[PDB]
Ligand binder design. Structure first.
Ligand SMILES: [Zn+2]
Lengths: 93, 54, 181, 81, 96, 94, 96, 83
DNA sequence: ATCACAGGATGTATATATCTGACACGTGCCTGGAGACTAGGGAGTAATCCCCTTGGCGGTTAAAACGCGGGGGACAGCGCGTACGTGCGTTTAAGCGGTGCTAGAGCTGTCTACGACCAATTGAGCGGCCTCGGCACCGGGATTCTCCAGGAT
DNA sequence: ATCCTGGAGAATCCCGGTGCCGAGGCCGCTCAATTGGTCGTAGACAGCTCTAGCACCGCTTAAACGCACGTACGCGCTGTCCCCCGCGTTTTAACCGCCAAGGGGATTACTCCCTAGTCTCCAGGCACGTGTCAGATATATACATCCTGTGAT
């Protein structure tokens, strides 16, 4: 009898952008649906890219390419910039 | 269905066109593949009545 | 029987379970014609009572003319495998004529399955009358044989004489009933 | 290799329109049509490039075009798949 | 000085183009259009001839479908002639 | 040499049952190959989801069946179900 | 006497319904419609209240989007009143 | 017990309100019927898929997720009722 | 002044003969399918707990249904004029075929850094709990809309 | 018939207080993340082959380009008419809160058995090769559809 969600992380992010803003349980539920939708897609595409190129491993590159295929304009771009860094840093961390 | 199209055209085989005609004439296949573009499929010969004279 | 067909099939009214009823179609076919012939005003047309199913309707025009009307279903599918070895013209009119003909439709006529001591009511029999006509008029492997006196053969003549022989004998002995069938 | 959109001849545009059942074409259609065709091509080509790049290639293959089209609700049959 | 009236030929062309399957857009022109677009993403890019054809068929298929809807819009508007706006409406309804 | 797989051989055979006297162009065959791979992926893809949704590691004849019902429309979907249901019933009986 | 003219209120209502977020379709009626439809496929068919609401919002969202396109079609046709054919065009273009 | 004619449960004001939200100013009398005949198809498609999913899972009660999958299958996603 | 007909003009479908290259069929591999085997984790089954759906009751209230009058938009009909279609003659570059170059796809073989896997430890996150604060609702007043009358255009 | 204030009459915004129940923070605890070590193989890399994509040339010729004529179409304007809208009064059933019953979803514990993974062996299927027939091309003939004149009505 236990579930998991991103409610706690979404809450925190709101503060990074709007330190004084709260959030309803529904808005949170909506954000949870959003996160899971985007997650599935990127993971789906990353799988496929590995598949198309006849590979077994998903790397940061497949994630990057998947991001571009799904996201339009700058959102795709800022996401790539951020993803690149997190990996670059995590390694050196 | 494509074979029937081939026969309609007095042929002994199926070509991409016959596949297109078959798929589209059959409502349920028309839908199953309703987003499919067939290389050299052409289109159905549907002409709007309002464009025709008396 | 009819295959999957999404849209409404208007012949549904003749279905009996899954099967297209030869009995219903023939019965209704003659019923329609009967009502309609009574609307023929300049010509006197009388309908005969039906006995078999090969001629759906026999019409009697004045005192001289009779007309046998056969109803047939048309199918444009490839012919059934049982016809695979039929139309045995390969050595006569050629394999290529045979192939051409088989790209054409075949027909089904309402016909009870006549058998040893009875019959099935809703069966249909395969019909190739259109091919028979094409053959009679294309009886040569030259295919234009007889349309020109240089290539005049007696196939057509022999058949007419054979038909005439049987018909004459049937007329001769129509009373002894030996030849009715 | 510039404004090659003009390489799409007027008759070429009209013929497509005809195939679509179009009987009469306004004189302003040619340009409007181009503004749409171009966007379509831009979206498809770019994805194909993205796939090509991912794969570390320089030549765009039919398969890269197919993936680009596919995802837009457009599977194309005939070039593999 | 025999002539066929306006619309007689137009319908004829419609019949034919619906019937046939061949590409209507000239190839070398189309191929170059692809490249001009491509060079805006990347220089020194190459294409297989089958890739160009794949693009062309999809491109024509797109436009034809667009024209069919455009034609319906013009008819809805009680008109035979299609105008830029009829294209725009169809696209919009489609989510573009 | 490297080697490629297709359904060309199976497509021919099916063609013979519907139209014993007809052939097929190389393009129509290429199209039928594109077709088969498309349908396969969809059914397998949906079947994948059903297995995931219902907390399974295995795809069975049911996940295939349900995927068929969801993907195919009207009656066409049905014949596919009838034939599949049977083929399994039969396979283990053959 | 005093009243607003035809169209004054309609514009007002457009503003208001665009503005508000609630359901426009009555709940029990909608719920029953769902069941009436459901009872075609099978019996023993039960619904959670959250399932019915999920259906209702999706259903309203669908119709509203359809009406937006319908309205545009009516405008395209130079009209204010929407008619069944404006709905039909919009749907057809969508590919329904 | 069996139900019926709840298509009328979608009342005239309800249709108008939807139309108005969509920017529709003026509505022909025949729209009501025409609209219902379209709403109905939409509902049929979504409900059916939800049922299909429900049946696959061998359940009797339809949950929000069954509806969500059904709507996703038709390509119209819905947030806040699961995901 | 309109109907239909006949003739011409044009374009289509038709049979015919010949050409060629794309299919249909056969050969020889060779590697993926099928059979045979063990091992163990997932799926099936039943227990049973209790949460949530169903059904029912009675008030109470807003929301629907109905009817009436009247303005306003939909529609049909008319006429203007211009923006397209059709056909002719001239210009263009597309398509075809062939040539020649080499850039980059595609495959092979080697080696090693990376991730699956497993066992141990623990603290980040989920469920349940209380607290009270932002939001929804009530009632009153301010002022910001729409619409008509009467006096200008 | 149309523009310009100025008032009357609703409708919508803003103000301040009630009160409630949904968010937000705290505590226990438990099981999913983290660490640390081992194994083996997927992927990185270099090397080499040779397919096929690019660039260029010249010739043939069917398409594209531009122009002139003229007329079917789009557009705007007018008037009818009828059918929606807006309001008020009557009628309905949706909604709310409360209650009880029990059906079926969710979790538990246990056990096979139905699959994955392994090795062995052979025939089904793919790459290549070859022959000839179907469809494409082109010729020429005959039938069908379209559009002005032309008499009949
Ligand atoms: Zn002869």
């Amino acid at each position: 009898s236990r579930k998991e969600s991103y409610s706690v992380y979404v809450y925190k992010v709101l503060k990074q952008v709007h330190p004084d803003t709260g959030i309803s349980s529904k808005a949170m539920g909506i954000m949870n649906s959003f996160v899971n939708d985007i997650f599935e897609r990127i993971a789906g595409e990353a799988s496929r890219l590995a598949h198309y190129n006849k590979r077994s491993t998903i790397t940061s590159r497949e994630i990057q390419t998947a991001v571009r295929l799904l996201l339009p304009g700058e959102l795709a771009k800022h996401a790539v910039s951020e993803g690149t860094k997190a990996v670059t840093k995590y390694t050196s961390a | 269905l494509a074979g029937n199209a081939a026969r309609d055209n007095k042929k002994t085989r199926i070509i991409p066109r016959h596949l297109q005609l078959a798929i589209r004439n059959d409502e349920e296949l028309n839908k199953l593949l309703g987003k499919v573009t067939i290389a050299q499929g052409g289109v159905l010969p549907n002409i709007q009545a309002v464009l025709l004279p008396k | 029987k009819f295959k999957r067909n999404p849209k409404e099939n208007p012949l549904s009214q003749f279905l009996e379970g899954e099967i297209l009823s030869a009995s219903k179609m023939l019965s209704k076919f003659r019923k329609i014609i009967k009502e309609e012939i009574n609307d023929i005003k300049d010509t006197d047309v009388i309908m005969k009572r039906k006995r078999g199913g090969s001629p759906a309707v026999t019409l009697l025009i004045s005192e001289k003319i009779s007309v046998d009307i056969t109803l047939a279903l048309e199918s444009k599918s490839s012919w059934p495998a049982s016809t695979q070895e039929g139309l045995r013209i390969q050595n006569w009119l050629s394999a290529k004529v045979r192939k051409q003909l088989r790209l054409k439709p075949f027909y089904l006529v309402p016909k009870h399955a006549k058998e040893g001591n009875g019959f099935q009511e809703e069966t249909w029999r395969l019909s190739f009358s259109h091919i028979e006509k094409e053959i009679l008029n294309n009886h040569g492997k030259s295919e234009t044989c007889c349309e020109n006196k240089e290539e005049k053969c007696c196939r057509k003549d022999c058949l007419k004489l054979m038909k005439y022989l049987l018909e004459q004998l049937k007329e001769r002995f129509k009373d002894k009933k030996h030849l009715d069938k | 290799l510039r404004d090659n959109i003009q390489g799409i001849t007027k008759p070429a545009i009209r013929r497509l329109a005809r195939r679509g059942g179009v009987k009469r074409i306004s004189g302003l259609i040619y340009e409007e049509t181009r503004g749409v065709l171009k966007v379509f091509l831009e979206n498809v080509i770019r994805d194909a490039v993205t796939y090509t790049e991912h794969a570390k290639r320089k030549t765009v293959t039919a398969m890269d075009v197919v993936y680009a089209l596919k995802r837009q609700g457009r599977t194309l049959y005939g070039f593999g798949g | 000085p025999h002539r066929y009236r306006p619309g007689t030929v137009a319908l004829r062309e419609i019949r034919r183009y619906q019937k046939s399957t061949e590409l209507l857009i000239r190839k070398l022109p189309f191929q170059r259009l692809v490249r001009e677009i491509a060079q805006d993403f990347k220089t020194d890019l190459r294409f297989q001839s089958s890739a160009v054809m794949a693009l062309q068929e999809a491109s024509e298929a797109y436009l034809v479908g667009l024209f069919e809807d455009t034609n319906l819009a013009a008819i809805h508007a009680k008109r035979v002639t299609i105008m830029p706006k009829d294209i725009q409406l169809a696209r919009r309804i489609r989510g573009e």
